Structure 1
């Protein structure tokens, strides 16, 4: 697992990208905890091929271009409850073939 360090009260970006992203074929989600059998547990954000279509709240966003596979998660105004494991799942057409990536977030005070 890759580890991201950020500051409490500041935003963080959890990195995820898919170079061969296709607007007609791909979609993705972020969730809390390790990537499960399918989709994302405790889903925080989801895209279609082009755009964010669902979001837990405005605390979660994507600052990159979705259509180019720049699907890194930005979490605003981090508090202690945001620390832990996150799942970035790139959805690929078919079964048992999504790209699953766990990211650990650690948070400190400045």
Structure 2
């Protein structure tokens, strides 16, 4: 599990990188599970973000180099929780899933 966090306010980045050919991914707000981002907050098509639930959610890394790290701007305590970085592959069982814990503490 990846552990990140900080005091509420400043941005935090949830690191996520994958291997192989460029492919689509989504971020889940919640633990990783069987199905693709059931509480999805960001979706990509491999090269671009196609949808985000909140404008605070940004992918500021180089997607073409498989850096799909999520930055949350203007963090709040309520952002705390488990997130899933899910990189989509062609099987049923072979998606790459990284679990990230986010801890945003009160100032």
Q: Which residue of structure 2 lines up, in the alignment, with residue 16 of structure 1? A: 16
Match of 2:63 in 1: 66
| TM-score, length basis structure 1 | 0.90
Cα deviation code 1:32-73 (max 9, x no counterpart): 111121211221101012110111021101001112111000
TM-score by length of 2: 0.92
Corresponding residue number in structure 1 for 2:28: 31
Runs of 4+ in 1 over 2 A off after TM superposition: none
For structure 2, list consecutive stretches of 5 or more residues without a partner in the other structure.
Answer: none
RMSD, aligned CA: 1.3
Q: Is there any run of 5+ residues in structure 1 with no aligned partner, and where?
A: none
Q: Distance in 1 between matches of 2:46 and 2:77?
A: 32
Shift of 1:16: 0.1
Which of 95, 99, 102 matches 1:98?
95
